[PDB]
Amino acid sequence: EGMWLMQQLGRKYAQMKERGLKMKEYDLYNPNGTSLKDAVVLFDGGCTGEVVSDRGLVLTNHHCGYDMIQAHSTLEHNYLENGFWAMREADELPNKDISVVFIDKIEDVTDYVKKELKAIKDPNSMDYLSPKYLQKLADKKAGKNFSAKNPGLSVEIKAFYGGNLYLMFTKKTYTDVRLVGAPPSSIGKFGADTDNWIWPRHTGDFSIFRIYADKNGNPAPYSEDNVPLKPKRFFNISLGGVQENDYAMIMGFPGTTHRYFTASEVDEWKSIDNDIRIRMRDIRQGVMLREMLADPQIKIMYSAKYAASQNAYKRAIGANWAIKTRGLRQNKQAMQDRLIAWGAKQGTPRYEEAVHEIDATVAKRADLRRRYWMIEEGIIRGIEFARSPIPTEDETKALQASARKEAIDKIRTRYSKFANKDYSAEVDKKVAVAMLTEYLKEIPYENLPLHLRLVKDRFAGDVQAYVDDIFARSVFGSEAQFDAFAAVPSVEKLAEDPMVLFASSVFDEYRKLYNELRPYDDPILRAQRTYIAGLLEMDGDQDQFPDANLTLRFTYGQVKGYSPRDNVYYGHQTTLDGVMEKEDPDNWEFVVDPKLKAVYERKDFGRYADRSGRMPVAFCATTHTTGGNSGSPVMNANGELIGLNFDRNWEGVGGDIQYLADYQRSIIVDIRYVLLVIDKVGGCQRLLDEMNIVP
Amino acid sequence: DEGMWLMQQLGRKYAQMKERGLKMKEYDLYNPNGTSLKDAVVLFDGGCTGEVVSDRGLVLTNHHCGYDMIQAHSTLEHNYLENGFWAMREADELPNKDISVVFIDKIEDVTDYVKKELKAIKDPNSMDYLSPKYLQKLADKKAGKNFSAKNPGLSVEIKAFYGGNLYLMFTKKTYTDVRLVGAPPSSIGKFGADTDNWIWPRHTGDFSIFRIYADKNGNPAPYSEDNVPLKPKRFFNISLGGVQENDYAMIMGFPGTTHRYFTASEVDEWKSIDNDIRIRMRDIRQGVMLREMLADPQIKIMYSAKYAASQNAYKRAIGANWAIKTRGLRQNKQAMQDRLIAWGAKQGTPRYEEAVHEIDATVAKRADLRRRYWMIEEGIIRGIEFARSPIPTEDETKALQDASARKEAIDKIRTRYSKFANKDYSAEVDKKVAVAMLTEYLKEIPYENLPLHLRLVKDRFAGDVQAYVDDIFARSVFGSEAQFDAFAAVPSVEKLAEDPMVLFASSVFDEYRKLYNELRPYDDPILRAQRTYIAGLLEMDGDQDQFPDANLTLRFTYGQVKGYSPRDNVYYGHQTTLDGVMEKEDPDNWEFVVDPKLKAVYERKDFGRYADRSGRMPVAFCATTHTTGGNSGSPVMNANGELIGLNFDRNWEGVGGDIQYLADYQRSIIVDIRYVLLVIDKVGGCQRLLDEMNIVP
Numbered sequence A: 001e002g003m004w005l006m007q008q009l010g011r012k013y014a015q016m017k018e019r020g021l022k023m024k025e026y027d028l029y030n031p032n033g034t035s036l037k038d039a040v041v042l043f044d045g046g047c048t049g050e051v052v053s054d055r056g057l058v059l060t061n062h063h064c065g066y067d068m069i070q071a072h073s074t075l076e077h078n079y080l081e082n083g084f085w086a087m088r089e090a091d092e093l094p095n096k097d098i099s100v101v102f103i104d105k106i107e108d109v110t111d112y113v114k115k116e117l118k119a120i121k122d123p124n125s126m127d128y129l130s131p132k133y134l135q136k137l138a139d140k141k142a143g144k145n146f147s148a149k150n151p152g153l154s155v156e157i158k159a160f161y162g163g164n165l166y167l168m169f170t171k172k173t174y175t176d177v178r179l180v181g182a183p184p185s186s187i188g189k190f191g192a193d194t195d196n197w198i199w200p201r202h203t204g205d206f207s208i209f210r211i212y213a214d215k216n217g218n219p220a221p222y223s224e225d226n227v228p229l230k231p232k233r234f235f236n237i238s239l240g241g242v243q244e245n246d247y248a249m250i251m252g253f254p255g256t257t258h259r260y261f262t263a264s265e266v267d268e269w270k271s272i273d274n275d276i277r278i279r280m281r282d283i284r285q286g287v288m289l290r291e292m293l294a295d296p297q298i299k300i301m302y303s304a305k306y307a308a309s310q311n312a313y314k315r316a317i318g319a320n321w322a323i324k325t326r327g328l329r330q331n332k333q334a335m336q337d338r339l340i341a342w343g344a345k346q347g348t349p350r351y352e353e354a355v356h357e358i359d360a361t362v363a364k365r366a367d368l369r370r371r372y373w374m375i376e377e378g379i380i381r382g383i384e385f386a387r388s389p390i391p392t393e394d395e396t397k398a399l400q401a402s403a404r405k406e407a408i409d410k411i412r413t414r415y416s417k418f419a420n421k422d423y424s425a426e427v428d429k430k431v432a433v434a435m436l437t438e439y440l441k442e443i444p445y446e447n448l449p450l451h452l453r454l455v456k457d458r459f460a461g462d463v464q465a466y467v468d469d470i471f472a473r474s475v476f477g478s479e480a481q482f483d484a485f486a487a488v489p490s491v492e493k494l495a496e497d498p499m500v501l502f503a504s505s506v507f508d509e510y511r512k513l514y515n516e517l518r519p520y521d522d523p524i525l526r527a528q529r530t531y532i533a534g535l536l537e538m539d540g541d542q543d544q545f546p547d548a549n550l551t552l553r554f555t556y557g558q559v560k561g562y563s564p565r566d567n568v569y570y571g572h573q574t575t576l577d578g579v580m581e582k583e584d585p586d587n588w589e590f591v592v593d594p595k596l597k598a599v600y601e602r603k604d605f606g607r608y609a610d611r612s613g614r615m616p617v618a619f620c621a622t623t624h625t626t627g628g629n630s631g632s633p634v635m636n637a638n639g640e641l642i643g644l645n646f647d648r649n650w651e652g653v654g655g656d657i658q659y660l661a662d663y664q665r666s667i668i669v670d671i672r673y674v675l676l677v678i679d680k681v682g683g684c685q686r687l688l689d690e691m692n693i694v695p
Numbered sequence B: 001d002e003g004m005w006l007m008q009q010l011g012r013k014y015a016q017m018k019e020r021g022l023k024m025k026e027y028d029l030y031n032p033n034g035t036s037l038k039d040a041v042v043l044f045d046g047g048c049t050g051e052v053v054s055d056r057g058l059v060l061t062n063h064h065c066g067y068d069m070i071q072a073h074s075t076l077e078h079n080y081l082e083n084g085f086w087a088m089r090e091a092d093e094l095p096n097k098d099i100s101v102v103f104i105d106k107i108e109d110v111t112d113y114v115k116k117e118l119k120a121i122k123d124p125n126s127m128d129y130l131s132p133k134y135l136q137k138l139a140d141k142k143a144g145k146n147f148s149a150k151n152p153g154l155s156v157e158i159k160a161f162y163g164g165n166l167y168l169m170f171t172k173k174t175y176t177d178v179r180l181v182g183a184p185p186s187s188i189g190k191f192g193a194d195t196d197n198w199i200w201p202r203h204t205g206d207f208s209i210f211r212i213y214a215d216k217n218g219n220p221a222p223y224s225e226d227n228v229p230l231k232p233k234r235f236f237n238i239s240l241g242g243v244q245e246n247d248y249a250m251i252m253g254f255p256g257t258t259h260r261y262f263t264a265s266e267v268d269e270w271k272s273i274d275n276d277i278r279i280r281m282r283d284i285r286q287g288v289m290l291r292e293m294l295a296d297p298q299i300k301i302m303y304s305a306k307y308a309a310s311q312n313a314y315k316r317a318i319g320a321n322w323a324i325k326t327r328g329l330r331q332n333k334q335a336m337q338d339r340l341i342a343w344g345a346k347q348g349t350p351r352y353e354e355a356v357h358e359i360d361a362t363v364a365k366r367a368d369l370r371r372r373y374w375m376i377e378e379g380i381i382r383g384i385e386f387a388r389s390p391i392p393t394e395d396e397t398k399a400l401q402d403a404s405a406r407k408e409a410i411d412k413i414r415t416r417y418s419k420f421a422n423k424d425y426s427a428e429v430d431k432k433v434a435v436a437m438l439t440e441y442l443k444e445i446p447y448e449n450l451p452l453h454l455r456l457v458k459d460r461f462a463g464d465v466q467a468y469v470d471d472i473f474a475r476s477v478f479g480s481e482a483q484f485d486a487f488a489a490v491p492s493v494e495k496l497a498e499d500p501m502v503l504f505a506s507s508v509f510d511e512y513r514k515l516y517n518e519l520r521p522y523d524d525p526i527l528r529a530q531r532t533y534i535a536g537l538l539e540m541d542g543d544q545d546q547f548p549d550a551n552l553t554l555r556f557t558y559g560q561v562k563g564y565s566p567r568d569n570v571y572y573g574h575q576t577t578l579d580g581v582m583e584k585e586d587p588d589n590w591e592f593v594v595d596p597k598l599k600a601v602y603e604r605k606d607f608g609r610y611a612d613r614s615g616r617m618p619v620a621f622c623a624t625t626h627t628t629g630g631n632s633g634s635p636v637m638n639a640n641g642e643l644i645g646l647n648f649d650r651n652w653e654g655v656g657g658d659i660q661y662l663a664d665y666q667r668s669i670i671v672d673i674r675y676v677l678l679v680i681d682k683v684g685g686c687q688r689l690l691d692e693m694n695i696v697p
């Protein structure tokens, strides 16, 4: 059920032993020694990774190393579509702008921070949540010359439990992290967008990197003289596999949760955030789909835009299903009522006052938040010409010296990026007419961005005429219209440009709404400090984990499937057979790699198939994960690596507010399938030989 | 494979059925010289199965079986299709015009009699052995002089089985006064609607209730206000013990057709011609129809039934092709015929190998013609609406060329034009479908094989399909209402003879009939060779583990209540519940609306004695019985012969089961009798029907 602090391992160890954990407490996490914790990394700032060899080899997801694989891909060597397997350490590709962070030490600094905070004076100060203030405190505690006295190391203080607990992390950062291996996109992204958030899942979501360091193992940026890192701890790979009900645990960096939402915050998330995103993206995607299906050239241009929009749309559908069917609102209401009744018993009314403050703030910002989500989903991300060029003050005070030619070249560059190879003005006019029609019916005249008032005033409610006029008269309506402007550019032309005025007034309204809504965050944040303090004083730390905040956490559970609906059961494990069932040569998502199809036909599974001769692919567990847990190591009862976390099912997206024991599962790629792909697809035996594989 | 057995075969299967869990005595299920459960089974309205469930002639069948009767009695004032119907007294039960129930009174083996009569073989290639006219003459000769007059209600019929190797005579008793008694609302009777068709898990309460009426003596009589309910020889008891995984289950009913003795070449033909053409052509048609329905809500209203009708056989073809591709149907037919050829070589009788060769050679010879026939039938005859536009008759044409018969000819033509261009017909949507359908057709069918008018696409329109279709509507008398009225005011036969839509419809129907006539001769050599082929299979492996193809005659099938795994890591259990109906509820989707009386029954958990041991309310279950079309409404029996459900569908993974039964995929989709009794009781409030039935604890 939780995403636990490392400090909480002691308090949970007894329950973990009852659930099947066999390894000693300090072999997993030791606060003043080496443990398994020392093989877990924050990969490229938002993913998890793990060290799997004495020479710094690292495993993470394919979608985590995707940008590094794409940056090294050319028409001649397409590593993204064909995979990449460096046959020697010297062939491993360096990557610019990459990092791996180890959590060297973690210390509770709550009393220190709470004492420093007593010197504030303003009771409404938000310094208790300020990264700048907490960094000043971290520097004061670690020392002035800390990064110079301890190279590669840095410190950081984070707030937990709404400002009721503080931890200082000593981090070791390596920036020479090289690409070692990756499966083809047919394996790494098999389900592609169709199978995203889906269980059963048949995706071999992995990529391999290697940490490089100086001669002493200290962090150093890319240098041709860098040598692989010999780490203090690395994971052993298990080949025993998994069985139903087996104990499993994960370590990683879950990003965000909202476990202490009030019932009113759940209502707001459903009725404003989710409903607006669902309604607006459904209109947008609907128009985009008709156009993509009618013109194959539009399908090529709008496919990535369509897929990007669908991702958070599917998350919202999954979240709204949980609110509707799993009683998320009711359970938050029961949580806050239990605290209010206990606070009445103790004679302390501050907890009931805190819930009231949150409720009143949510109620007060409802119309503004609705207007913000309406313009953001509807126009800012809904209409492409909302992001068309707007002349800067420097560019206008140049058009009215030959700095006029400098202004037109900068504006031209931005116009070229807006109307690129993937931009269709005809498809954009069709999307805008549908998106604006919905927007104009939901936002009243007195609340509209200034230019949108012209629909009623100048165009007599004709949205198609308003959009047609924007393109017909704008200098950014076509290439010819822009070149005519660039030949005779006047600031008067730009000041009255219908597309410039549209983009300007929709962005003005978007910023005005953002600025008006920002003040409402602080009273809720301050009230949550009191609210969570009461919940902890009443029920304690065990069941009540702190919200995820991109810090190292552990979660445990079992390898177990679930029933998604009446009379249907999804087991705990998928197989290579399931990849072959899904094979569609004419669907780019479900194409199967010929070397992999051959392994399946010949049963060339070696030491990786199960006791029944079936080749596993993925498995699912009752662990509690969220975004940031991509690439997380999955451990046995003995701490040996059995898989990598890569997703969670859609029925569990509401798990960021309330864990769903009967639906929520972590989708993990089996480590036996990872080794099968490295071995029989990549032929990279040197990586298998480098790992410590246990029978 | 796991058969649809003749009643004659119950004797030689009985020990296997008992070993599998059957507890009832053989002759209590079927006895040729006396009353048995077989007497409570009926052929309902010519194509469904039904069952008598009371001593007063009450009959259960599917909702989709009694759907036309429910619709005919529905008005704006009393919409029985939408709200349901529950006659609170026998006098309130509604009569139905053109309805029948057929009982199979006696079944007799007449093989020797027919084979002896056939020896008067004036021609060895005679198809009289399969002729309904010839076999009826033989049935009449055997039954006697004016049998129907001497036994009012009774009739006799002989059918061929095993490709002409076995013949049975059936004595049928037909009742035509069959009244509507009860029906659930459509939100229960057709819950999944088109989305859940051929789908398991299934949550549909597919049932309707009728009652057989007869004269004072229980003899068949047409509708009369003096008719009285029938007291039957036998009726089913209703069980409330329910089902458990692996429980024995059996069905009796009238499966219509199977192709269990197809050669491997016939399976290839079915896949590559029949199914691939239907799949490709309906996919183009449905694709255009969908874009238009999604763009104009008025087009969605007009084309919804046409879209759904086209999808039904399209889904069946996808399911059938999946089985051919993944379950080795072709290979198993090849193994069957190779086994026979090897055995025939050992016996020194080459006629079986010669029979399979005849079938193969015939299939190979008709390939181009059959491809052209399916291409025009799926592509144009069914694919394009203006293919069925009016064609002036020889008499209508003659009338327009010196009497008042001219105005009668125009009124007849107008009537047909009005039926073609009806409230649901869109010329714009039809031009869009035709342009896509004809483009694919012109791509597949060469110039020298095209219907005469379609040659104009290349010759007159320079390959512009859109121009050809645009011209048909622009110049045709049936292109618009105004174009028709202009014709009707000044009608000339010259105008009709050169009309582009008339010429299109005429030449596509000419080519369709030419292809049909050229292909008909190829049926007879295959049929004659199948008589020799099945004779060998029966002589080699016996009339024991290979059942005769379904032919709309009474059969029994047995198996177990069991689910299946459709794909890797997914299991579908054997039983659905009321909870599953509630999960699927969508108030804005007409298919998944949930009746308020049913929703409250669930919330209140008002399940009476109908819920299972765990307190869950059962809805449907699935079994390894072998069913096909015609089995809709079939009674599902316990190990004791008590009614536990009504068959109403089969999953798509089992549609290939008409050629080869699929033990690990094929399942009959049955509505639980406890759910039927819950709907009658708590949704209809019709206690008199529950009191009338013999319900066992």
Ligand SMILES: COc1ccc(NC(=O)Nc2ccncc2)cc1
Residues within 6 Å of the ligand: B194, B304, B305, B308, B309, B312
């Ligand atoms: C909204 O109008 C509609 C009218 C009819 C249908 N269903 C239908 O025709 N189903 C069908 C099932 C099996 N065989 C043939 C046809 C659906 C929607």
Ligand SMILES: COc1ccc(NC(=O)Nc2ccncc2)cc1
Residues within 6 Å of the ligand: A577, A580, A581, A583, B326, B565, B566, B567, B568, B569
């Ligand atoms: C097109 O190629 C293939 C088609 C089917 C399979 N798998 C298979 O037999 N199905 C199966 C059903 C249920 N559970 C596990 C497996 C493999 C390849």
Ligand SMILES: [Cl-]
Residues within 6 Å of the ligand: A038, A102, A230, A231, A232, A233
């Ligand atoms: Cl280290």
Ligand SMILES: [Cl-]
Residues within 6 Å of the ligand: B327, B661, B662, B663, B664, B665
């Ligand atoms: Cl099977």
